[PDB]
Write a protein that binds this ligand. Structure first.
Ligand SMILES: NC(=O)c1ccc[n+]([C@@H]2O[C@H](COP(=O)([O-])OP(=O)(O)OC[C@H]3O[C@@H](n4cnc5c(N)ncnc54)[C@H](O)[C@@H]3O)[C@@H](O)[C@H]2O)c1
Ligand SMILES: NC(=O)c1ccc[n+]([C@@H]2O[C@H](COP(=O)([O-])OP(=O)(O)OC[C@H]3O[C@@H](n4cnc5c(N)ncnc54)[C@H](O)[C@@H]3O)[C@@H](O)[C@H]2O)c1
Ligand SMILES: NC(=O)c1ccc[n+]([C@@H]2O[C@H](COP(=O)([O-])OP(=O)(O)OC[C@H]3O[C@@H](n4cnc5c(N)ncnc54)[C@H](O)[C@@H]3O)[C@@H](O)[C@H]2O)c1
Ligand SMILES: NC(=O)c1ccc[n+]([C@@H]2O[C@H](COP(=O)([O-])OP(=O)(O)OC[C@H]3O[C@@H](n4cnc5c(N)ncnc54)[C@H](O)[C@@H]3O)[C@@H](O)[C@H]2O)c1
Ligand SMILES: [Mg+2]
Ligand SMILES: [Mg+2]
Ligand SMILES: [Mg+2]
Ligand SMILES: [Mg+2]
Lengths: 281, 281, 283, 281
């Protein structure tokens, strides 16, 4: 029993309802201008991993545009932490399962921030089921529409604003590599993201645009209590070698590494931040 | 230059119009009852790799149900090769982008053959584009609906008919592992298939149903001249270490291995038949 | 974990199959040969027992003549020889220590002499010495493990090259541990990772000469390497950890080798066939 | 052609003899106390990647013990850069192909620095040959003794001194994943390092010691002109998608990430810094 049994009825989950509250910030973390003056669009940056990435990026001197569905309280709080760092922050609520909106958040980021340098595709929804026979066509399509189609549409719109030295980071998952028997459709979307990352990296390498991914293991975020039942929530992260789930702040440095010139010779790759699970990486 | 320059105007391609005709049968291949009495459903079994698999399976004593879109001439020919081995063959035309049709082919297979033992998900369409900006939502969704959603729907319908000792094989692609800059959407669907394979193997292992895949490299099939330009077609397969594309007959024994009790201790895996491209396999 | 086999241990490695309970199953009674390797001449190191015995017998059933190299298990090599010859093919026994370079050369020369040529090489010998941690791995054990597990693959394969031609094949036995790691077999796993990279590199080296190079990565297989390396407790629960919740039998590995050794895998080189009870290795 | 044709008649190579000199430092690199007060032992830290790692670690506040064979000029030069950052630097020459020396460098590091927190195993030699027949047993054993046996011996001796929160990083290579036809023995040592990394991570996880690796692609270091011929040297790095070899400084931030608390949820992994080569990572 790593975490207290709990569950939220609607997804996307709300961070402010969780106990304990995910740690999205490392108090000892010191920014060093790794992304100074850079303009970022992070989808799903209002909470969980996205929140921790937004704040770390702001600490590194980046201006952050945060897209999210409707978690206004969570998004505002994230905006407070971001602006505390003295950079610009824009909130872009809306449903990214709609192509047009995927285009709109990109246009809006460029209008308010002035330009776009770094795109972090990170939104997701997950609907556990005991087997394939319990996955309806409706859930299948919905899961793909937000998990992978949004990555295509937002990235596609961002391409007319990206130039040499710019970067794309996609949040995938350990399940793309290891599979998950109770998240078959979700896993398929994550495998799709991994192949997307690989192919797009090769497509944009000569344009000087790098494309990489982060594959988290079990991280304590609103996705967990809003998708899994209480029993499972209580044992979350107990399966990995470190015997604990990760906290969102533990993911941020991977994104900072991939987003900055620190990884100038890196494209088409995945950073596995998963508590010790070996994936032939 | 490996093949003569040629291009077919519509996809799915027609095998009888190709020069040279793919070699779908190994003259020296000797069946040994590896699948005697087994009932098989293979989607996309009318031509290319599926055609070679259908025929090898028939030489191994299995009854074959073949689903395909509308290539009646190719399907008919495949049927004559299968029947020559003295087994049953059932042709199932129709559009597998429709969920109900996915369910119907499974029901029809059971009706005609009596039961279902081996499912081979193998249908695909691919639409090369010079970059992500040239992929419409229409193309993206179409590509996913046939390449991965059909694998989900057909397999889901098959589950109520599969029992201990039964088997699922999914055709993926080298592109899920290596990426392909001109087939970003298609590669994404193949990455989805890889993860699907891994998750489903874990879901069904205690039910005694194995699930594996085959990742071909460049194989001479109707998919090639129906998707790529005449120039690309003429050099097809010159990029791999063996410096030639594979022939469909060269894929069939991997499917035989995975379909039979020869691989009784194998599940969740991928067989790479690609002319020597190293994929950290 | 749970008990999958009777508790047992052999305080001598390489292990002896005739002492095991139950005897591993190295033959599928229902397996039907179909001349996939008719007239081929094979050299298999460690072909006297476990996986190697199963491969020898299956290859014989496919029409291949088998030269079997092993260390000192004459009882096992002879019994294997009986099974091979029962399939109506030739069998040559090649005892000796493959941790010695010259002997690696000699077994190749001998094979060509008695069989007349060499078409297929299966590098399969291995020793393993579990330790609870790296601090318990001596330099002695380290070098010994490498010398037999990977140096012999280099030396035997190297000697085989002047005899292999277009259409010939090399198969190397690796292990799931090269992919997943194994905390109690750190040096062994390092030798298996070395074999994976050797397989990949050599495949590219020989592709234009028409010689294919592939490997098989077994999971937990009930063979003499198990009771002779692990303690009784560990042996009793062997194979309980994998998704299929059981160890594999040696006969369950042979068809992968047949696939890789024959023309059935003509468009395959540089690859690994994972036969491990369902462990996902990002394969 | 990427570099000037050049070649050194002895290995390990000497960095001061190279044209152009490898860039081991990013002038705009800003340290942020990521490793403040940490005590590091780096084998092969005198030149190439190791030099860039030593210097970046010094900028992050770490004290550096540098082991190397006998390249005293290079080691002294690296020492000056390290000490410029106000941290301690210890030089430890000697042949790590000897087990006792491997133990001695660890004992010496602990004596000079007070403790050991981070071990970077990075030493290597490589002897290209046109084929397996051209690899003598002498070369094979030499290659393994330094490339992998030293990693075992040095790490083994370090275990007495490592506790919760400490870290091991091993330098592997892309060749372990992709293979290399002219570096068959070397590649096998690097494949050994990958498996070593994975197994040791699982062995040490409950002790709170993380173990990860870095797999570089073609990096311009003394190893290159000292092993490859002038023709090959001149075209070095032109094979990867970014169409250039990497510079040592582009490797340092990955080591910084893996060495610091920034990767607290990362063990058993590999960071691929290779100019865009996809390796199913
Ligand atoms: N254990 C884990 O948390 C875990 C493991 C592996 C991967 N991931 C990945 O982490 C990423 C971030 O998720 P998280 O765990 O931080 O949880 P999260 O709930 O905090 O973040 C997901 C975000 O996606 C956004 N979103 C969902 N549907 C949307 C829609 N229709 N339109 C616009 N935005 C929408 C929400 O605003 C939400 O905040 C996801 O891609 C997820 O797949 C998470
Ligand atoms: N170079 C290659 O040929 C190559 C490489 C990697 C993977 N593959 C895979 O091999 C598999 C078989 O393709 P192939 O190369 O043999 O070409 P193929 O054209 O011979 O087979 C593909 C089949 O898919 C079927 N299909 C397409 N759309 C359909 C739909 N709407 N409804 C029902 N059926 C439909 C067609 O009947 C067609 O015969 C595919 O999954 C493909 O992705 C091929
Ligand atoms: N669970 C498993 O059994 C398992 C798992 C993964 C990989 N493998 C691999 O399978 C292969 C065969 O092993 P097995 O499990 O069948 O056990 P096995 O003991 O039956 O076969 C190994 C053989 O290696 C030979 N050998 C050992 N030292 C030798 C030496 N010094 N000189 C010459 N020959 C020597 C012995 O003759 C022995 O018969 C090995 O490469 C092993 O690493 C086994
Ligand atoms: N293109 C590349 O440079 C490339 C590619 C992939 C991996 N790598 C890896 O990078 C690591 C660093 O090498 P590099 O390229 O920075 O070259 P380098 O020559 O600058 O560093 C290697 C160091 O190993 C040390 N060394 C060699 N033999 C020794 C011995 N017997 N005893 C003690 N020390 C010894 C030398 O002091 C030398 O400085 C190596 O592990 C190498 O395999 C390099
Ligand atoms: Mg949220
Ligand atoms: Mg067709
Ligand atoms: Mg034996
Ligand atoms: Mg040096």
């Amino acid at each position: 029993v790593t975490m207290p049994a709990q569950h939220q009825n609607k997804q996307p989950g709300i961070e402010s309802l969780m106990n304990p509250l995910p740690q999205f910030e490392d108090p000892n973390y010191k920014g060093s201008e790794k992304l100074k003056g850079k303009n970022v669009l992070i989808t799903g940056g209002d909470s969980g991993i996205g929140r921790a990435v937004s704040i770390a990026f702001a600490k590194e001197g980046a201006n952050i545009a945060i897209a999210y569905l409707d978690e206004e309280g969570d998004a505002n709080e994230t905006k407070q932490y971001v602006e505390k760092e003295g950079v610009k922050c824009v909130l872009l609520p809306g449903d990214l399962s709609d192509e047009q909106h995927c285009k709109d958040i990109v246009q809006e980021t460029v209008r308010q921030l002035g330009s776009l340098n770094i795109l972090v595709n990170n939104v997701a929804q997950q609907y556990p089921q005991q087997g394939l026979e319990y996955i309806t066509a409706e859930q299948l399509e919905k899961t793909f529409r937000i998990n992978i189609f949004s990555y295509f549409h937002v990235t596609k719109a961002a391409l007319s604003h990206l130039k040499q030295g710019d970067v794309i980071i996609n949040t995938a998952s350990i399940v793309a590599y290891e599979g998950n028997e109770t998240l078959i459709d979700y896993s398929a979307t994550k495998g799709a993201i991994v192949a997307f990352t690989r192919s797009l990296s090769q497509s944009l390498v000569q344009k000087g645009i790098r494309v990489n991914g982060v594959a988290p293991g079990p991280i304590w975020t609103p996705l967990i209590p809003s998708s899994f039942d209480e029993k499972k929530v209580s044992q979350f992260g107990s399966n990995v070698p470190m015997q604990r789930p990760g906290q969102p702040y533990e993911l941020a440095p991977a994104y900072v590494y991939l987003a900055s010139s620190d990884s100038s010779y890196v494209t088409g790759q995945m950073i596995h931040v998963n508590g010790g699970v070996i994936v032939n990486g």
